[PDB]
Amino acid sequence: STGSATTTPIDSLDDAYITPVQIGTPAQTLNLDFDTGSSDLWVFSSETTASEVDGQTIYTPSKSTTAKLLSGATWSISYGDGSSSSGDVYTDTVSVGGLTVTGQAVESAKKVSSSFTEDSTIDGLLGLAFSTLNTVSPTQQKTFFDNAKASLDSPVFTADLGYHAPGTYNFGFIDTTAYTGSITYTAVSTKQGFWEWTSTGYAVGSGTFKSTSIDGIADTGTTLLYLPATVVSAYWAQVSGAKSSSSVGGYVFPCSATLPSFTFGVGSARIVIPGDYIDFGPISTGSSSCFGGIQSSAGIGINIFGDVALKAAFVVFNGATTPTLGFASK
Ligand SMILES: Nc1cnc2c(c1)COCC2
Numbered sequence: 001s002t003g004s005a006t007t008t009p010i011d012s013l014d015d016a017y018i019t020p021v022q023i024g025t026p027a028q029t030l031n032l033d034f035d036t037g038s039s040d041l042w043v044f045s046s047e048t049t050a051s052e053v054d055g056q057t058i059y060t061p062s063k064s065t066t067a068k069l070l071s072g073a074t075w076s077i078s079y080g081d082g083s084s085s086s087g088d089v090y091t092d093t094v095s096v097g098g099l100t101v102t103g104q105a106v107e108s109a110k111k112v113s114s115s116f117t118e119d120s121t122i123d124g125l126l127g128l129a130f131s132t133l134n135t136v137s138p139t140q141q142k143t144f145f146d147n148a149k150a151s152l153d154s155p156v157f158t159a160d161l162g163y164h165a166p167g168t169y170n171f172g173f174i175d176t177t178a179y180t181g182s183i184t185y186t187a188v189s190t191k192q193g194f195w196e197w198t199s200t201g202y203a204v205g206s207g208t209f210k211s212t213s214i215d216g217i218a219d220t221g222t223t224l225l226y227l228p229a230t231v232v233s234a235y236w237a238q239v240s241g242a243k244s245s246s247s248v249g250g251y252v253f254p255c256s257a258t259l260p261s262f263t264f265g266v267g268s269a270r271i272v273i274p275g276d277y278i279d280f281g282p283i284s285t286g287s288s289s290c291f292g293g294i295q296s297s298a299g300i301g302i303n304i305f306g307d308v309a310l311k312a313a314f315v316v317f318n319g320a321t322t323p324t325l326g327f328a329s330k
């Protein structure tokens with residue numbers, strides 16, 4: 001089998017991407033944030049505290065003839081921005097782009113934190129990291145990809161995120177029309193439960209490439225590119241007036257600037273992020289200070305190849321017995 005679904009930016013900045021997902025019988029369609037940095041499929045629901053729902057579409061398990069309470073199971077998760085959610089668990093039928101899994105754990109939110117309530121465009125998350133990170137207790141549950149894998153034509157999914165435009169998540173096949181050149185594959189460590197790999201270096205604009213190993217994660221659920229402070233300083237030094245602002249929480253730059261590109265290495269290959277992808281707009285409405293898309297990972301403990309990096313490539317998440325990652329230009 002295969003599946004193919006369009007993913008759409010939630011706003012004019014590409015802060016995140018939503019993909020429609022069918023849950024239950026009859027289908028209830030929710031728009032979920034596909035997140036290769038976590039491993040829980042959770043949704044706003046009829047159980048979510050009413051004051052914490054503001055415009056999202058909810059899953060109502062009592063209206064699904066295939067929903068079953070997973071007795072005793074609870075979940076609770078926290079993300080890198082300090083946001084969080086928790087609740088109980090149903091199993092139900094879940095379909096993405098024509099690909100169907102029966103018996104998928106659907107984690108129903110009883111509580112969500114303010115940043116989720118405040119974002120009316122995201123109805124939940126669909127985790128695509130390794131199932132060892134799944135938070136369900138006392139019986140850990142499998143991701144949608146892990147449950148689908150045996151039925152797929154090939155044990156892979158691909159992320160093709162757009163810049164200010166829709167893109168595609170495919171399951172079970174590699175669309176050879178969606179990229180240019182060849183796909184370069186690179187090793188993955190699953191030891192932290194992430195799609196963790198090692199970039200071979202970087203370049204700033206037209207500058208010379210610096211060969212240096214940069215361990216990080218491919219994370220569709222993180223907006224920006226978080227790299228070591230040395231790398232980030234070298235990038236922003238090429239932008240007149242750019243500076244790190246403790247009050248704003250990162251590097252800012254004059255909105256009048258034209259930003260240089262940033263290149264990262266994948267083996268001997270190179271992925272170029274155009275400068276415009278690094279512009280995240282005014283820090284507050286009407287300001288002439290703009291927020292940068294490349295930020296320091298120093299206070300995180302891990303480097304993160306988030307959407308800013310991934311949307312410059314066609315990315316293969318290869319879930320074969322030994323997982324690997326593939327990157328192609330497009
Ligand atoms: N830092 C961070 C990483 N991933 C996510 C969030 C924050 C919040 O939305 C869910 C996914």
Ligand SMILES: Nc1cnc2c(c1)COCC2
Nearest residue numbers: 015223280282283284291
């Ligand atoms: N994506 C994104 C993340 N953080 C910030 C902005 C955008 C805007 O400026 C303030 C801080």
